[PDB]
mmCIF file of C-alpha atoms in Angstrom:
data_model
loop_
_atom_site.group_PDB
_atom_site.id
_atom_site.type_symbol
_atom_site.label_atom_id
_atom_site.label_comp_id
_atom_site.label_asym_id
_atom_site.label_seq_id
_atom_site.Cartn_x
_atom_site.Cartn_y
_atom_site.Cartn_z
ATOM 1 C CA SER H 38 197.154 329.717 101.266
ATOM 2 C CA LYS H 39 199.058 333.187 101.471
ATOM 3 C CA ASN H 40 199.625 333.835 105.530
ATOM 4 C CA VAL H 41 196.852 335.749 107.339
ATOM 5 C CA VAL H 42 197.463 338.316 110.085
ATOM 6 C CA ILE H 43 195.071 337.769 112.805
ATOM 7 C CA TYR H 44 194.578 340.152 116.041
ATOM 8 C CA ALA H 45 192.920 339.423 119.264
ATOM 9 C CA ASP H 46 192.976 342.051 121.397
ATOM 10 C CA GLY H 47 191.511 341.587 125.322
ATOM 11 C CA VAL H 48 192.617 341.970 129.259
ATOM 12 C CA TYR H 49 193.253 338.329 129.374
ATOM 13 C CA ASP H 50 192.920 338.571 133.377
ATOM 14 C CA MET H 51 193.360 334.739 135.019
ATOM 15 C CA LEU H 52 193.715 332.852 132.023
ATOM 16 C CA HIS H 53 191.556 330.121 131.262
ATOM 17 C CA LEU H 54 190.142 328.018 129.492
ATOM 18 C CA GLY H 55 187.496 329.701 127.863
ATOM 19 C CA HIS H 56 190.279 332.509 126.795
ATOM 20 C CA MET H 57 192.279 329.665 125.139
ATOM 21 C CA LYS H 58 189.735 328.042 123.313
ATOM 22 C CA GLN H 59 188.601 331.974 121.600
ATOM 23 C CA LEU H 60 192.498 332.374 120.879
ATOM 24 C CA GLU H 61 192.355 329.045 119.381
ATOM 25 C CA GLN H 62 189.632 330.090 117.125
ATOM 26 C CA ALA H 63 191.461 332.958 116.369
ATOM 27 C CA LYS H 64 194.192 331.241 115.040
ATOM 28 C CA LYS H 65 192.459 328.535 113.412
ATOM 29 C CA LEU H 66 190.024 331.026 111.041
ATOM 30 C CA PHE H 67 192.814 330.462 108.098
ATOM 31 C CA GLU H 68 194.732 327.453 107.251
ATOM 32 C CA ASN H 69 197.735 329.926 107.453
ATOM 33 C CA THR H 70 197.853 332.584 110.225
ATOM 34 C CA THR H 71 199.613 334.671 112.657
ATOM 35 C CA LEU H 72 198.142 335.453 115.916
ATOM 36 C CA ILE H 73 198.620 338.897 117.296
ATOM 37 C CA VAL H 74 197.409 338.987 120.328
ATOM 38 C CA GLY H 75 197.170 342.582 122.336
ATOM 39 C CA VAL H 76 197.012 342.918 126.083
ATOM 40 C CA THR H 77 195.734 346.092 127.126
ATOM 41 C CA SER H 78 197.369 348.275 129.953
ATOM 42 C CA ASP H 79 196.701 347.982 133.587
ATOM 43 C CA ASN H 80 195.415 351.316 133.921
ATOM 44 C CA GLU H 81 193.460 351.910 130.808
ATOM 45 C CA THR H 82 191.460 348.129 132.174
ATOM 46 C CA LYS H 83 190.432 350.323 135.726
ATOM 47 C CA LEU H 84 189.451 353.451 134.370
ATOM 48 C CA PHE H 85 187.338 351.587 131.360
ATOM 49 C CA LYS H 86 186.248 347.859 132.279
ATOM 50 C CA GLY H 87 187.106 348.186 136.206
ATOM 51 C CA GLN H 88 189.355 346.202 138.450
ATOM 52 C CA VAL H 89 192.141 343.798 137.224
ATOM 53 C CA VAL H 90 194.062 341.054 139.087
ATOM 54 C CA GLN H 91 197.015 340.278 137.394
ATOM 55 C CA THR H 92 199.344 343.270 136.385
ATOM 56 C CA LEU H 93 200.175 343.735 132.385
ATOM 57 C CA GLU H 94 203.522 341.991 132.912
ATOM 58 C CA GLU H 95 201.944 338.813 134.726
ATOM 59 C CA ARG H 96 199.175 338.391 131.705
ATOM 60 C CA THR H 97 201.331 338.703 129.435
ATOM 61 C CA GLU H 98 204.263 336.673 130.394
ATOM 62 C CA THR H 99 201.203 333.736 130.488
ATOM 63 C CA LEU H 100 199.784 334.240 127.359
ATOM 64 C CA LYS H 101 203.382 333.568 126.192
ATOM 65 C CA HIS H 102 202.769 330.343 126.833
ATOM 66 C CA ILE H 103 200.255 329.748 124.809
ATOM 67 C CA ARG H 104 200.636 327.836 121.711
ATOM 68 C CA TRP H 105 197.722 329.763 119.510
ATOM 69 C CA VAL H 106 199.820 332.409 120.579
ATOM 70 C CA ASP H 107 202.404 334.333 118.126
ATOM 71 C CA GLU H 108 203.039 337.748 118.866
ATOM 72 C CA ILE H 109 202.027 339.858 121.824
ATOM 73 C CA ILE H 110 201.570 343.640 121.178
ATOM 74 C CA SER H 111 202.063 344.688 125.726
ATOM 75 C CA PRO H 112 200.231 347.135 126.179
ATOM 76 C CA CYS H 113 197.969 347.557 123.251
ATOM 77 C CA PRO H 114 196.101 350.171 122.566
ATOM 78 C CA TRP H 115 192.677 350.458 123.677
ATOM 79 C CA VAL H 116 190.861 351.051 120.670
ATOM 80 C CA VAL H 117 191.921 349.325 117.476
ATOM 81 C CA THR H 118 191.906 352.570 114.457
ATOM 82 C CA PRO H 119 192.658 351.411 111.065
ATOM 83 C CA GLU H 120 196.699 353.295 111.384
ATOM 84 C CA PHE H 121 197.010 350.394 113.607
ATOM 85 C CA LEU H 122 196.017 347.889 111.277
ATOM 86 C CA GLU H 123 198.188 349.181 108.825
ATOM 87 C CA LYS H 124 201.276 349.799 110.238
ATOM 88 C CA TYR H 125 201.097 345.866 111.492
ATOM 89 C CA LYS H 126 199.765 344.788 108.633
ATOM 90 C CA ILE H 127 196.706 343.002 110.340
ATOM 91 C CA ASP H 128 194.027 341.366 107.875
ATOM 92 C CA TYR H 129 191.435 340.633 109.966
ATOM 93 C CA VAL H 130 190.185 341.376 113.903
ATOM 94 C CA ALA H 131 188.664 338.682 116.479
ATOM 95 C CA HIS H 132 186.658 339.510 118.593
ATOM 96 C CA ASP H 133 183.657 337.269 119.778
ATOM 97 C CA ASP H 144 178.521 349.342 116.961
ATOM 98 C CA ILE H 145 181.921 350.681 117.687
ATOM 99 C CA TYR H 146 183.298 347.450 115.715
ATOM 100 C CA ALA H 147 180.855 348.833 112.214
ATOM 101 C CA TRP H 148 183.922 350.497 111.076
ATOM 102 C CA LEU H 149 186.213 346.864 110.942
ATOM 103 C CA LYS H 150 182.814 345.201 109.678
ATOM 104 C CA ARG H 151 182.323 347.423 106.536
ATOM 105 C CA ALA H 152 186.319 346.771 106.004
ATOM 106 C CA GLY H 153 185.755 343.118 105.890
ATOM 107 C CA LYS H 154 188.264 342.774 109.049
ATOM 108 C CA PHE H 155 185.835 341.699 111.437
ATOM 109 C CA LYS H 156 185.561 337.859 112.269
ATOM 110 C CA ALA H 157 183.524 336.543 115.631
ATOM 111 C CA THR H 158 184.640 333.809 117.883
ATOM 112 C CA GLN H 159 182.363 332.495 120.505
ATOM 113 C CA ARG H 160 182.968 332.587 124.039
ATOM 114 C CA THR H 161 183.353 329.550 124.994
ATOM 115 C CA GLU H 162 182.812 327.905 128.709
ATOM 116 C CA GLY H 163 186.407 327.415 130.748
ATOM 117 C CA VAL H 164 186.397 326.196 134.667
ATOM 118 C CA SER H 165 187.243 330.296 135.688
ATOM 119 C CA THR H 166 189.102 330.996 138.992
ATOM 120 C CA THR H 167 185.339 331.876 140.035
ATOM 121 C CA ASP H 168 184.265 327.682 139.158
ATOM 122 C CA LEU H 169 187.284 326.598 140.616
ATOM 123 C CA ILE H 170 186.875 328.239 143.828
ATOM 124 C CA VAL H 171 182.918 327.804 143.465
ATOM 125 C CA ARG H 172 184.076 324.004 143.554
ATOM 126 C CA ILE H 173 186.413 323.490 145.664
ATOM 127 C CA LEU H 174 184.209 325.308 148.327
ATOM 128 C CA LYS H 175 180.945 323.556 147.564
ATOM 129 C CA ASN H 176 182.653 320.546 149.652
ATOM 130 C CA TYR H 177 181.669 322.335 152.656
ATOM 131 C CA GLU H 178 177.392 323.352 152.621
ATOM 132 C CA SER J 38 220.953 317.452 117.061
ATOM 133 C CA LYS J 39 219.266 314.412 116.917
ATOM 134 C CA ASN J 40 215.659 314.478 118.585
ATOM 135 C CA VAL J 41 215.389 313.993 122.203
ATOM 136 C CA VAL J 42 212.025 312.511 123.595
ATOM 137 C CA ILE J 43 211.037 313.713 127.265
ATOM 138 C CA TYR J 44 208.676 313.069 129.413
ATOM 139 C CA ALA J 45 207.234 315.196 132.777
ATOM 140 C CA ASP J 46 204.386 313.635 134.477
ATOM 141 C CA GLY J 47 202.194 315.163 136.990
ATOM 142 C CA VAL J 48 198.541 316.610 138.306
ATOM 143 C CA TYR J 49 198.415 319.899 136.644
ATOM 144 C CA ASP J 50 195.380 321.058 138.527
ATOM 145 C CA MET J 51 194.470 324.662 137.807
ATOM 146 C CA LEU J 52 197.374 324.860 135.990
ATOM 147 C CA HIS J 53 199.291 328.180 136.266
ATOM 148 C CA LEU J 54 202.482 330.042 135.355
ATOM 149 C CA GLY J 55 204.532 327.830 137.553
ATOM 150 C CA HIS J 56 203.542 324.352 135.847
ATOM 151 C CA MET J 57 204.063 326.315 132.407
ATOM 152 C CA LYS J 58 207.488 327.839 133.108
ATOM 153 C CA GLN J 59 208.525 323.952 134.450
ATOM 154 C CA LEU J 60 207.123 322.525 131.111
ATOM 155 C CA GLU J 61 208.883 325.405 129.325
ATOM 156 C CA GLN J 62 212.132 323.979 130.830
ATOM 157 C CA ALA J 63 211.224 320.621 130.237
ATOM 158 C CA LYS J 64 210.970 321.474 126.942
ATOM 159 C CA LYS J 65 214.065 323.282 126.333
ATOM 160 C CA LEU J 66 216.444 320.696 128.117
ATOM 161 C CA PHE J 67 217.871 319.911 124.890
ATOM 162 C CA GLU J 68 217.679 321.635 121.153
ATOM 163 C CA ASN J 69 215.389 319.120 119.317
ATOM 164 C CA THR J 70 212.729 317.694 121.936
ATOM 165 C CA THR J 71 209.575 316.173 121.943
ATOM 166 C CA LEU J 72 207.539 316.860 125.382
ATOM 167 C CA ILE J 73 205.184 314.156 126.344
ATOM 168 C CA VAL J 74 203.590 315.037 129.751
ATOM 169 C CA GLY J 75 201.549 312.305 131.590
ATOM 170 C CA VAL J 76 198.727 313.260 133.050
ATOM 171 C CA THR J 77 197.363 311.815 136.428
ATOM 172 C CA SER J 78 193.862 309.894 136.146
ATOM 173 C CA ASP J 79 191.687 311.329 139.084
ATOM 174 C CA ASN J 80 191.285 308.325 141.065
ATOM 175 C CA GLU J 81 195.089 307.740 141.881
ATOM 176 C CA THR J 82 195.662 311.298 142.785
ATOM 177 C CA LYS J 83 192.841 311.427 145.528
ATOM 178 C CA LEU J 84 194.323 307.481 146.881
ATOM 179 C CA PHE J 85 198.050 308.624 146.774
ATOM 180 C CA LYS J 86 198.175 312.480 146.652
ATOM 181 C CA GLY J 87 195.065 314.016 148.050
ATOM 182 C CA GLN J 88 192.036 315.738 146.564
ATOM 183 C CA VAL J 89 191.978 317.890 143.110
ATOM 184 C CA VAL J 90 190.000 320.066 141.869
ATOM 185 C CA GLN J 91 189.711 319.686 137.990
ATOM 186 C CA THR J 92 188.686 316.171 136.473
ATOM 187 C CA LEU J 93 191.328 314.593 134.017
ATOM 188 C CA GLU J 94 189.135 315.788 131.112
ATOM 189 C CA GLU J 95 189.828 318.994 131.895
ATOM 190 C CA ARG J 96 193.220 318.852 133.257
ATOM 191 C CA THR J 97 194.647 317.409 130.158
ATOM 192 C CA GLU J 98 192.372 320.007 127.743
ATOM 193 C CA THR J 99 194.224 322.848 129.094
ATOM 194 C CA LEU J 100 197.644 320.684 129.033
ATOM 195 C CA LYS J 101 196.833 320.879 125.213
ATOM 196 C CA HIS J 102 196.765 324.493 124.884
ATOM 197 C CA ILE J 103 200.049 324.609 126.242
ATOM 198 C CA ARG J 104 202.828 325.657 123.916
ATOM 199 C CA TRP J 105 205.621 323.444 125.114
ATOM 200 C CA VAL J 106 203.670 320.171 125.536
ATOM 201 C CA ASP J 107 204.297 317.895 122.227
ATOM 202 C CA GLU J 108 202.403 315.045 123.535
ATOM 203 C CA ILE J 109 199.996 313.687 125.879
ATOM 204 C CA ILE J 110 199.421 310.869 127.697
ATOM 205 C CA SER J 111 196.079 310.782 129.762
ATOM 206 C CA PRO J 112 195.965 308.890 132.337
ATOM 207 C CA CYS J 113 199.372 308.152 132.752
ATOM 208 C CA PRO J 114 200.798 305.637 135.231
ATOM 209 C CA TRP J 115 201.365 306.971 138.547
ATOM 210 C CA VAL J 116 204.825 305.228 138.665
ATOM 211 C CA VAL J 117 207.312 305.180 135.815
ATOM 212 C CA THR J 118 208.733 302.188 134.792
ATOM 213 C CA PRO J 119 211.530 301.087 132.788
ATOM 214 C CA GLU J 120 208.853 298.933 130.232
ATOM 215 C CA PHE J 121 207.155 302.262 130.165
ATOM 216 C CA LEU J 122 210.395 304.237 129.174
ATOM 217 C CA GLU J 123 211.043 301.799 126.820
ATOM 218 C CA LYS J 124 207.446 301.369 125.138
ATOM 219 C CA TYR J 125 207.290 305.069 124.675
ATOM 220 C CA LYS J 126 211.109 305.563 123.863
ATOM 221 C CA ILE J 127 211.746 308.303 126.474
ATOM 222 C CA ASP J 128 215.267 309.517 127.124
ATOM 223 C CA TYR J 129 214.419 312.009 129.976
ATOM 224 C CA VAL J 130 212.209 312.018 132.775
ATOM 225 C CA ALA J 131 211.999 315.519 133.830
ATOM 226 C CA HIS J 132 211.070 316.147 137.238
ATOM 227 C CA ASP J 133 211.792 319.118 139.989
ATOM 228 C CA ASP J 144 214.985 308.026 146.261
ATOM 229 C CA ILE J 145 212.420 306.675 144.245
ATOM 230 C CA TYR J 146 213.725 307.949 141.419
ATOM 231 C CA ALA J 147 217.117 306.292 142.123
ATOM 232 C CA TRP J 148 217.128 304.223 139.032
ATOM 233 C CA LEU J 149 216.519 307.115 136.720
ATOM 234 C CA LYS J 150 219.642 308.646 138.040
ATOM 235 C CA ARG J 151 221.573 305.408 138.029
ATOM 236 C CA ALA J 152 220.473 305.199 134.151
ATOM 237 C CA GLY J 153 221.419 308.921 133.288
ATOM 238 C CA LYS J 154 217.611 309.651 132.580
ATOM 239 C CA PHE J 155 216.722 312.232 135.780
ATOM 240 C CA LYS J 156 216.801 315.627 134.577
ATOM 241 C CA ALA J 157 215.786 317.810 137.355
ATOM 242 C CA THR J 158 213.472 321.372 136.904
ATOM 243 C CA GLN J 159 213.279 323.950 138.988
ATOM 244 C CA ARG J 160 209.876 324.452 140.978
ATOM 245 C CA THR J 161 209.280 328.583 140.168
ATOM 246 C CA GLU J 162 206.558 330.686 141.533
ATOM 247 C CA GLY J 163 203.277 331.570 139.587
ATOM 248 C CA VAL J 164 200.267 333.532 140.537
ATOM 249 C CA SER J 165 198.463 329.946 141.978
ATOM 250 C CA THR J 166 195.080 329.713 142.129
ATOM 251 C CA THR J 167 194.979 330.633 146.235
ATOM 252 C CA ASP J 168 197.847 333.915 145.034
ATOM 253 C CA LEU J 169 194.688 335.412 142.963
ATOM 254 C CA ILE J 170 191.892 334.857 145.288
ATOM 255 C CA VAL J 171 194.471 335.978 148.545
ATOM 256 C CA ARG J 172 194.993 339.121 146.153
ATOM 257 C CA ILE J 173 191.516 339.678 145.142
ATOM 258 C CA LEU J 174 190.488 339.348 148.978
ATOM 259 C CA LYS J 175 193.370 341.691 150.539
ATOM 260 C CA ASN J 176 191.381 344.318 148.818
ATOM 261 C CA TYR J 177 188.841 343.845 152.098
ATOM 262 C CA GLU J 178 190.904 343.713 155.208
#
């Protein structure tokens, strides 16, 4: 029906099939969507999450090539606020509590986390050929 | 103007920014294109190229998520033939000789190879934090 604005955020470090399937899921929550993807800054990722392998510019440039991604906010705020949802006219936030206010507003949509061949799975698979 | 059919083939093992930018380049050779991507079989890749880390199904499923990819032939033939170009109505083959017949026919379009953060670059970068 009318176009629905979906917001998903994350680090998207070392993007793999799992992230890709999660972005696809967010994109297909309704039949007509705009999927906005937020990419966290390097410093806030290091402060709150721990290490980050790829810079903001590399993580964002990679997400650009992904079919489901309609718009990117890079860097994105670390914490979603109601003012943020209003400013970008976001209808739903896709994630896989601190998010209780989103559920209270009907704006929380869960995606799944799926398995991908992560970078770690690739290395393990290559190395297993050597004991 | 009229829609132009572009064919690009490869292994697309451990897809990274470099492959992505090359697929983007192929897709944007003309203003209206259909980009067909051929994905080589596991056995022929092992025979002719050497090892392959990801299976055909994993390499193909990853390419599916890439914005520039309009169609995928998986597995694709290892050698492009004129009969293949006719059967799929391919106007141009994008690559980065054995391809002399393609240039003679005006069907050869070069893309670039660019740098991406390959899996090897990622590992090196992570490990450099330890001597």
